[PDB]
Structures are given as C-alpha cells and as structure tokens.
Structure 1
Amino acid sequence: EDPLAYYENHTSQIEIVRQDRSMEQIVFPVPGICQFLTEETKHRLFTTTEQDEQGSKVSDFFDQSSFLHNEMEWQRKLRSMPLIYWFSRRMTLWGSISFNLAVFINIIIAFFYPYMSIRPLIVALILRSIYYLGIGPTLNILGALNLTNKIVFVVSFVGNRGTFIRGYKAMVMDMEFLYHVGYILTSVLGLFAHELFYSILLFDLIYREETLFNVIKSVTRNGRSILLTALLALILVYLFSIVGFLFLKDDFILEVDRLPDSTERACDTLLMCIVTVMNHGLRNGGGVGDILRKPSKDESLFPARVVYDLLFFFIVIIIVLNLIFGVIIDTFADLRSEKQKKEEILKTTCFICGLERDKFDNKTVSFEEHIKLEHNMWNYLYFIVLVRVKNKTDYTGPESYVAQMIKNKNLDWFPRMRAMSLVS
C-alpha cells in the first residue's frame, strides 16, 4: 500500500571497515531468499553461538552463514510444498499427543498389569473404552495411535529441521534423529512384542523439559570425577576386606533366608569378603560394623573391632561417599556461574562489535538503536547472502571488497570494538 513503508521494510544497512581501516556504511536491499529464515533458527543461533579465544562470535556466525542459507532455501521449498508444510508447522502438537499417549499407556499398564484443556475429556474417553472394550483392546488402540503419531512427528521433524539437507551421513550423525528413531523402535516393540516395553518411553520427560535436562547436566558434566571417586571407594573396600579376611574372618557372618542353617559365612574367600563389604557396608549408614558380629567387651579383639568399624565409617561413609555429592554441588555452582556470565554478556554486549552498553551513555544514538539498526547480525547475514547471490560483474566497490575478504577467509571487514556513531 505504502511504497515508502515497503522499501523501508525491505532495505537494510551495515557497517564495514575498509582496508585503510576507515568505517563505511553500506545500504543494500534485502535479498528475497532471506525472508524464509525461521525465528526458531535465529533464536537458537543467537543463544548458542560461542565466543572464541579473542572473545568474538563473528567467526562462528560466518561459519554458520552457509548452513543458514541452505536452511532458507529448504524452507522456501517446504513452503512451496503445501501439505508437508502443514504437518511441519504443528511439530509441537504431535510431540504433545505422543507424550500424553505414552503417559496414559504407562499409567494403564502400571494400574492393571498383569491383565487377563482436553485432557479430562481424553481421560473420560479412555475410561469408557476400558469399561466397554477392555483393558487390552484399549491398550492396543492407544499404542496404534502412539505409533501413528510418532511417524507423523518424525516426518514433521525432518521437514522442519531440514537435517537431510546437510546429507544422509549428517542425518545419521545427528543424535536427536537417532533418539527419535529409537523412540519409534521402542513403540513398535511395546505394541508387538510386550506391553511393558512402553516403560522406556517415559524417558521423554528429560527431552521435553529443559529444567530437568539442566538438573541432570550437574551429574553429567563431571561424571568422570564421580566414577573415579567410586573407584577409590572400591579400592578402600578392597583393602578393608583384605584386613577383615586376615584378622576378622569369624566376625563376617551374614544371616540369610533360604527359599523352600540361618547363618552363612561371608569371608571364607577374599572375593566373597569384597562382595559382602561392597554390597552391605557401603549401603549401611554405620558401615561394615553393622553387618559384622557384635563383639563383647571381654573379648580380646574388642579394641581392634572398634577401630575397624570407626575407621571404615569415617574414611568411607563420611568422606568418600560425601565427595560425590560435593562434586555434584560443585558442578551445580559451576553451571550457574557459566549461565549467568553468558546471559550478562548477551544482554549487555553487542554481537558484532562487542561494545558495552555503558559506552553509549549520554550519546545521540542509544545502545538499543545500535543493536537494532546500526549493528544487526541478521543484516550482516543478509549482506553475505547478497554477495553470494549477486553476479561478480554487478558487484559494487564495497560488495567486491567484502567478497574478496570472504574468499580470502579474512573477517576484518566486520567492525570490531568500533562504532561510527560513537566516533561522531
């Protein structure tokens, strides 16, 4: 309707540092293909791009420019193709029905096996189905719907993410796609082989909820330290079992219940003594002393038993075991610190030039204006796409310079720690 509005919307500007180290502003029209870029991809790139040793994200942005262009082309083709576009747009929905179906199937299995919002309405329908058709038939229908929905969901996933664009090998490499095919296989196994196979599907909660994944990251980030602490605990258990076998074999008497004497020796062999110690002392608050025979004061080995029990309790139960929890808390603190630093940098730094907000105080151009218009990462991406699309003969001066820098793999054309408005 408004030529000025249309042209302003479709016109962009960027700032480039020339060879003579002078800044210039290039005003260019937005390439048509750029319109197909997705907000989800934009947000993922913005929140995932990592600083380099020098502290600049420009290298990663430039590296991912080509993948972004390929994604734009694939999105244009997907929009051209109607039905698969309709399926792709509703990716979240399909995941929702899949998760709800898995939860309901697992609840029914838990509450009946062995056998023979719209959520309240779905629950009532399932209850009526159980009442009329039966538990088994209801589970069969639920599993069939789950499998169909998951097939649709994987189709929508490939349509939206466009993982196939990179290549078949890349598609196989992607971990999320493998997780999804594993989900399909588990659903098939649950439907056809055994109903209890649906239990594994409850692991989808970690994938769905970001908070739970962040919580588990506390355990996974430094799992090597936890495993090494467990190995140290095993070594200490081995030494304690050696000492017990040599000096305290008789005390190792474990009561047992025999399926159709009530006490059996447990330290006749060092392997058995190790197994007993590892299984019981580590799982007992007191330690190995609780399982070991209660000594009388008159007994000669009473001080030896007291020292043995107290040493085990202090060394293993109180120190070694608590070190794993200390490591988990430590990882929690590290993760929080890293997240806070990243959020602060993202909020109070410019992506392209890296200038801080304070530098823009008492200036004609605000920091918000700088980030929105003067230094916009998507404007730089659009300029790169323009350079790639445009023919060499039609290049202008700045376009030729930027194309030569791109060919030579030089990123200096990006403005670093410099802003034209701040200078003037």
Structure 2
Amino acid sequence: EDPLAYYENHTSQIEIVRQDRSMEQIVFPVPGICQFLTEETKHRLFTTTEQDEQGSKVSDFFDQSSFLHNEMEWQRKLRSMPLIYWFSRRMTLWGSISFNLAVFINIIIAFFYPYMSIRPLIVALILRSIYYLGIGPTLNILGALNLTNKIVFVVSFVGNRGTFIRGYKAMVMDMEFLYHVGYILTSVLGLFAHELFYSILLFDLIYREETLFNVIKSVTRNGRSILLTALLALILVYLFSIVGFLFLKDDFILEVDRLP
C-alpha cells in the first residue's frame, strides 16, 4: 500500500501534564496489538462510564485498562482461529434467529394447542411443514433448531465477550451468562418434557428491546416504595375488616355458584 498511509495509521498523539504543571504533546507509534480492539467494547466503555465524586471519568477508564488489555489479548488469540472468529462475528444473527424461532413456536402453540424477505419465507416454510409434516413434527423441528441455534449463540457469546478471561467465578457471576443458561435449560426442558414451557422464552423480548426494559425500570428502581405502599393498603384493609366484623357482619353476604 501507500508507504505514508501505513505509518500515518499507526501513529498517535496525546497531551500530558508534567510534575512542573507544564503540558507536553507526545507522539508515539501505536502498538500492533492495539489494532485488535473491538468497536462494541469501545462503545460500551464510552457510554457506561460514570463520573466520580470529583466529576472526572478518568479514574474508571484507567481502572479498566488491565481488563481492556486482556480483552485485546483474547481477541488476537481468537483471530488466530478462523472458525471461532466466524462463529463470533454472527452473534447478532444467531440471537435474531433464536428469538424469531421462539416467537414462531409460541405462536403455533397458542393457535393450535392442544392438538392430536426472510421472514415471509420462513412463514411459508412453517405453513408448508405444518400442512405436510404436521403440527407436532413441525414443532419438534423448530424446537431442535432453536436448541442448536441457542447453543451456537452461547458459544459465540463466550468467544466474543471472553468473560472467562476474568475467571470461572467471574463468568459464573455474570448475570448474562446465568440468563443464557436459563434459556438453554428452558429450551431443552420444553423440547423434552412439555410444549407449554416455551412460553417462558417470550420473556426474552425484554432483553431484545431496550425501550421495553427502560419502561420496566420505572416500576423497578422504586420497587421498595411500591411494596411498602401495598403493605399500607393491606394494613388499612385489615383495620377495615376488623371494624366491619365487629359491627357490620350480617351485611357481608356474597353470591356463590356451586358446581354440580
């Protein structure tokens, strides 16, 4: 390529303040490893970082330097293996396929249970399979496909995120991994035990859409206040019940429909 372009790409400049309170500009060559940083991690760090008591975000950025370095090390190692890199690159595709499959199986279950572009094409294929194979076999193939899709998604997730780099305790602690293993457990359990269990997978919608999660957060940040208010309502109901029972007991008459 152009000789000046490569050297231009691998050069960076920064500004630092010395112990003498003077500012100095440092031009240095970018390390070869630094080229392997992921864009998703960059965006996550940029948005997630929060101001400290002094109002500067530098502290957290520095504290994350070691984790960032380890992540880039793992990214280079992953880039060494082509197959794993290809699997990791399609994390969004795997997740979208899994969610679409879950929606379709739930829809079919709701419509038929109990029984004896790309999206329209999948709809037509599902309809044809139902017409020929049947509702049962079609649900079976959809469940198996979802199972393999989710297992591949989990593998891609661990490879891309590299949460195992922190340690086994760290990966187990991560809530996302726990949610994903919950998903795989629910999928296998439904495929092998009962079809209705697929309904649980619909909760994945909350994870898929950010706006829905933000809406739910309104009734989650101050959940304690809501529970305490409910307890206050219960206490008032208890006092009202005492007052009624002591004085107005004959008026508490209800209608009941007795089954044969």
TM-score range for the pair, normalised by the shorter chain length: over 0.9
Deviations 1:179-229 (A, max 9, x none): 000000000011000000000000010000001000001111110100010
Partner of 2:196: 196
Deviation at 1:257, TM superposition (A): 0.7
In structure 2, distance between residues paired with 1:174 and 1:78: 21
Deviations 1:66-118 (A, max 9, x none): 10100000000001111010000000000111011101100110011111121
Deviation at 1:21, TM superposition (A): 1.2
Deviations 1:373-418 (A, max 9, x none): xxxxxxxxxxxxxxxxxxxxxxxxxxxxxxxxxxxxxxxxxxxxxx
In structure 1, distance between residues paired with 2:49 and 2:106: 39
Deviation at 1:136, TM superposition (A): 0.5
Paired residues, number: 260
In structure 2, distance between residues paired with 1:2 and 1:127: 55
In structure 1, distance between residues paired with 2:64 and 2:213: 26
Deviations 1:232-265 (A, max 9, x none): 00010011001001111111111111111xxxxx
In structure 1, distance between residues paired with 2:169 and 2:111: 43
In structure 1, distance between residues paired with 2:6 and 2:89: 27
In structure 1, distance between residues paired with 2:18 and 2:252: 82
Partner of 1:387: none
Deviation at 1:9, TM superposition (A): 1.3
Deviations 1:333-386 (A, max 9, x none): xxxxxxxxxxxxxxxxxxxxxxxxxxxxxxxxxxxxxxxxxxxxxxxxxxxxxx
In structure 2, distance between residues paired with 1:205 and 1:94: 15
RMSD: 0.7
Point out which structure has higher relative CO (alpha carbons under 8 A, 6+ apart). 1
TM-score, normalisation: structure 2: 0.99
**Secondary structure at the counterpart of residue 255 of structure 1:** coil
Partner of 1:235: 235
Deviation at 1:3, TM superposition (A): 2.2
In structure 2, distance between residues paired with 1:112 and 1:128: 15
**Secondary structure at the counterpart of residue 26 of structure 1:** strand
Deviations 1:14-53 (A, max 9, x none): 1111111111111111011111100000000000100000
Partner of 2:41: 41
Q: Within the alignment, does 1:26 sit opposite 2:26 as a pair? A: yes
Deviation at 1:2, TM superposition (A): 2.3
Give ranges in structure 1 of 5+ residues lacking alignment.
Answer: 261-424
In structure 2, distance between residues paired with 1:109 and 1:247: 52
In structure 2, distance between residues paired with 1:25 and 1:104: 58
Deviations 1:307-345 (A, max 9, x none): xxxxxxxxxxxxxxxxxxxxxxxxxxxxxxxxxxxxxxx
Give ranges in structure 2 of 5+ residues lacking alignment.
Answer: none
Deviation at 1:7, TM superposition (A): 1.3
Displaced runs of 4 or more, over 3 A: none
In structure 2, distance between residues paired with 1:122 and 1:53: 53
**Secondary structure at the counterpart of residue 64 of structure 2:** helix
In structure 2, distance between residues paired with 1:228 and 1:160: 42
Q: Within the alignment, does 1:134 sit opposite 2:134 as a pair? A: yes
Give the 5 Å matches for 1:6-155: 6-155=6-155
Deviations 1:253-285 (A, max 9, x none): 11111111xxxxxxxxxxxxxxxxxxxxxxxxx
**Secondary structure at the counterpart of residue 253 of structure 1:** coil
Deviation at 1:4, TM superposition (A): 2.0
- Structure showing greater radius of gyration is 1
Deviation at 1:137, TM superposition (A): 0.6
**Secondary structure at the counterpart of residue 6 of structure 1:** helix
In structure 2, distance between residues paired with 1:155 and 1:57: 33
